[PDB]
Amino acid sequence: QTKADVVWKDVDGVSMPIPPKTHPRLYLREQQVPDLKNRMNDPKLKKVWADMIKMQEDWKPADIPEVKDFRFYFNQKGLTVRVELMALNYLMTKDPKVGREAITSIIDTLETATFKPAGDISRGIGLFMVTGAIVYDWCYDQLKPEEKTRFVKAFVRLAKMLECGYPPVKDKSIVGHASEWMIMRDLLSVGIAIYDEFPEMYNLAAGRFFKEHLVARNWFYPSHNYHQGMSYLNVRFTNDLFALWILDRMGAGNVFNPGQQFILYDAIYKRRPDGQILAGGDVDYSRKKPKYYTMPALLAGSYYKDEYLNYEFLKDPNVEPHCKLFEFLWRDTQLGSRKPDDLPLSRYSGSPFGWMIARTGWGPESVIAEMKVNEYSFLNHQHQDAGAFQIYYKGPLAIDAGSYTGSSGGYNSPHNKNFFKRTIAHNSLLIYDPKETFSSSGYGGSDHTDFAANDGGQRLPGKGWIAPRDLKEMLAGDFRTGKILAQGFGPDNQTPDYTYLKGDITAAYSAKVKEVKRSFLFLNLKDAKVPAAMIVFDKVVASNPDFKKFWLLHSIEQPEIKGNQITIKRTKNGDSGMLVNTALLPDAANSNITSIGGKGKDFWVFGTNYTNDPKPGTDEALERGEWRVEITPKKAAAEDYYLNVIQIADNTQQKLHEVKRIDGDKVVGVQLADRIVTFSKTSETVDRPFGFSVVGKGTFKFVMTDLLPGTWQVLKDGKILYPALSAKGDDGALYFEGTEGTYRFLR
Amino acid sequence: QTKADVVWKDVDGVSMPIPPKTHPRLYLREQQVPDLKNRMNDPKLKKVWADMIKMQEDWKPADIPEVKDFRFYFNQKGLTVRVELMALNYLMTKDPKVGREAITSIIDTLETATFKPAGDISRGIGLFMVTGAIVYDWCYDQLKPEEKTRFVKAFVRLAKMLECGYPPVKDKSIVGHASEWMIMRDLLSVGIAIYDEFPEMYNLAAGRFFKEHLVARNWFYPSHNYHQGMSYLNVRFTNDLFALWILDRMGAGNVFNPGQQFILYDAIYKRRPDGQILAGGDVDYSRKKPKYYTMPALLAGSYYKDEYLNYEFLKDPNVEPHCKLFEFLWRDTQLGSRKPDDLPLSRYSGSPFGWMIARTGWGPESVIAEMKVNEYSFLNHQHQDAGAFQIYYKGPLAIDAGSYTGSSGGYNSPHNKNFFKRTIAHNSLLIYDPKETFSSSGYGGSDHTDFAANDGGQRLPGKGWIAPRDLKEMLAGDFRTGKILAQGFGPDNQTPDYTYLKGDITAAYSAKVKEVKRSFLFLNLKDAKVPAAMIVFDKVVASNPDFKKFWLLHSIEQPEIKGNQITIKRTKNGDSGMLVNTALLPDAANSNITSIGGKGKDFWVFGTNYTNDPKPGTDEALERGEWRVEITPKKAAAEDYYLNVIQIADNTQQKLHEVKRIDGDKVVGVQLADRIVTFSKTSETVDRPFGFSVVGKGTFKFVMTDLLPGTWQVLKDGKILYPALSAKGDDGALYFEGTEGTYRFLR
């Protein structure tokens, strides 16, 4: 990271940097060349250089798979590695002999190379381009004029092979393959190298990046999160960070919103004590080895000099072979590292997300709870999971169900289209319109189907479940799925007693609903015995009273239902957690609670089970799940409310807190332990006097929500208790402590 | 206060109550009649009744004044008192002789009474009408048919004499005389009384009230304040409260937004230790008798059963003669009372106000500070005072200058039109456009002036400085003067360390400015020696760099200027306060600080002194002021910033705090005592990394404003200090404690 010293020009209203008229300019400038010897003498970096020396050896003919995967090419070996090390040596020695060998060794094969149609072949093709780009840029003054021309024509030939095409007009700028290596690393790298001879490639590659990719990312970056789920976070954010490094090292400074530094903190918050990461979007499961975000933590931690991110990298400081050079060039070995233990227990991601991640600690006894609005849907690997909550404690308890791969297949599978990516897979809300259709004609790259199953769930946005080209198309289309209404945590910023999130998710559904709102209130109970609780309060108004309403709670093992109580336990894989839901609304007289699951019913969608068993040896804990509970109104009605209170504890915990519903004036609420929480009876803003009664011993902590921001007066037993308290705009809430009595509130 | 039990039907889209088919219905119904005996037996209420018995005596002919003022009539004596007591007695005894006597004693004079035209005479006419309405309603069953007709014609005759006219089509529904007794008490009372025989009067009076008055008041009531200044609060709010009591007692319940209860708390916050009230709008000054809000406190306190307001009534439980009956009927004598001592030290009034009142205590050592945005202007007795601050501590220190009356005259005086109601009289901002025109043709109804003086101040809204008819007309016009941008007070709700308010007041001025912003930060320093400080940060962008800019500070006595330091002291009237302003921006190299004042210069407006000496024996402390300081930039520039730090102490205090300006990355700030406060150097939202250095011993309290809401990271001496703090939407600020070092903030 250094200040920009390049010239900037507008191209069609969009400011862009001009590559400096000097080589090297790819991945480094002369400015950092003398530091290469220090890096070579850096013992942390010597090992990575040794790794690359080993990479110089050709593939053993018998070891070659013959189906040359993207993984084949990313496990980089042979000539391309050799010429890269030659170019590096030329930078450090300036010896005309070494720089020439790099050039003469690569040119012919760069012109002639062939690639059998194979899985993500663009990646191998793009990496082969990168090899040439390194030699071209780093040994530039050694190039003969005829060779430069030969290199250019070879690069154009190779570029045309890429899935984005050349010109790079195909695919999408926020998600999909064009949001991976092909543009942000590969085409951009070549462009920078050959700019003095063929400026077109840079103008096309950087052109699209600055116009689309950059604008789209800068839009959500301030909220410090990513939208492709907890696996594809890796490749997608890695390539964002490649563009960051490539352009800063070119001389363009940081081109992104610097909030980029804080995106990977989400992964940190979602890490479990078993080494796995809380689920979200397209993910598979394992208990074999911990999940790591090595490349993003390397690139982001080193650039932004972030100790929390460097800790993450140091967990497994082992970069994929094709990335070794980039670790050598860009890693900060002087940077320290910090365990996450002193991070606030709750973190909030605002627009366009509206996601809360709440913990009760950083150790083995941690409850980890996720609450999501989703203001927009990004599609691709994101799920239609507006309103979803997810809870982990000593095992996955309230689960995000299904699996990316399995017996059903991969991304294009019936399981993905009909269960995994759909609302029914999640702890959210269904409203079933028998006449609703779900257009899926543009989903996936093969095995296309025109329509998906009716899950009573959320819309499939886009032109048949097609992601938008860019931010412009996204904002103009039907990708809006919600509105964050309220959020906060406290009273303490470090160890909040409560974590609150409210969203209106009507836009996530068709016109089968008039209104859908969900309010989450997580309680850190500050107790080893019953460490946490979550209260979920829903308003659902269907356009037709006969549209069946569903409240879902997914689990791995079979739930036990007794009255208004659902008990879920983990008893396998060393997990011992327990979840207990008390259903308060609909009331027992209007409540049907039903469990669906087990063999043939694990992925049940209104008449069809979308079977997806794990690949042998994978998902040993069955985190894809086998069970769910559906809470449904007995009586058909346009307007229904759900109120559910979840307690979390060890499966050996016998005594859980008594849960009381509070039926007040204008409010409905919950009381358990020393906590009182209220919501508007209509889930709409309360702007007039209201009240309720409290019965019980000791001091209670009150969170009153859905209140008109401004000054409130609190009375108890007809006497003013708090003459003036402020409800603020962000949470629309009153907070205070008090004892039992009859409460009135004035505004 | 009882639940509504009458029928409602829409009239031209507006729901209105129908008077019940029963008498009595004026000021009480049958449900309250038996309780009259109990009230007569109440020691507190027997005295007011005895007061009324005394009022029965006629005026002494020699003591009758030449001019029958509104004060003459409100000092109600003779026949009209007698007949009201006869009617009360008829309700209580049901004796036909009594009811008949009330009717016969009043009927002749009611139809023949004459009132010499004066211009406040509507009040005496209206009260005479109320006397007749009492007899009519309370003795209804004793009325003969012929007498009913005589009463109706008499009431219509009297109604036509009122300023609003009959039909009530003249004047204004938010301010002016039609927002006083004539409709909300007087015409409404008669309408209700005679409804069975002549529903037209009620339909017109209540029709206008429900369509216009009620709508306007409900619109601003939730922010718990009033817009007519600290004197006219009395008559204006009193009449709102008459409408409240009249309509509830009729059977319509509470027709107002119940936020009405909290309006009078502002007066409580503005009370000084010397018994007077902080200035605002059209006010005069006395040190003789304390100012009381007796009638509002009686009516609001008793209706809403509010002990703080009842305390305010009990300070001086003496209502004007013409209101004694209403005390007898409506006073709650069982209600308790509370001194203001346990009230939070700061109170916020939101849209359409944006006012902070901040204190350091409730006793003799109280600092009292007012900070105002003004989102809308209501005109009439409100001043064009957007951005103004005012500070009291052992005397008026930073003053709201001028006086309502004096040698210049009253409401229509050149002093009112050219100084008192104008920005120049206030601690606010001037931008002088020499070509600017200020139309005042409609001021004072339709009075003669046409154009007022150029004070370089704020616009005169309306059709030549007149108020709009109602809310509809107000919102469609040019009455918007500002936008609340941010607000909040200190970590503790009860005793906040800081009180913050930011407003954009561009709308208050003409096109001579492109942008005007003012941020206030009040500090409660929690120290006897220097109790408080106020930091004021202004951004002013003029449309012409040659347009002279002014920052004003008004005082009673002569300010002492020394370099960048302005010292102001009170040494008279038993006052001993001191204000010391440190001018930080403009820098001393670009700052000119000039005192203007003394005789012939006390109300100086660019060449002309608008003289307004007190009436003999009034304003003995000269709170109208004699002096001001103007801070002006040396260099002509379109854009200028003002940064001023006011410290408050006893004038005997020799040691005040050193004030350091903090010149940071993207921020400009202030350091004094143990407090750090920063603003955006541009006064625009900061959304990228920034920082500054702190030198000094011990722990400091940091308030960082103008920040993009979301999660921020704090670093000190290159190490993460706070990994994650939240800036919230309402204040857009970070709060934390820290020691000396070099600070960086990431977003």
Ligand SMILES: [Zn+2]
């Ligand atoms: Zn999912």
Ligand SMILES: [Zn+2]
């Ligand atoms: Zn004023």
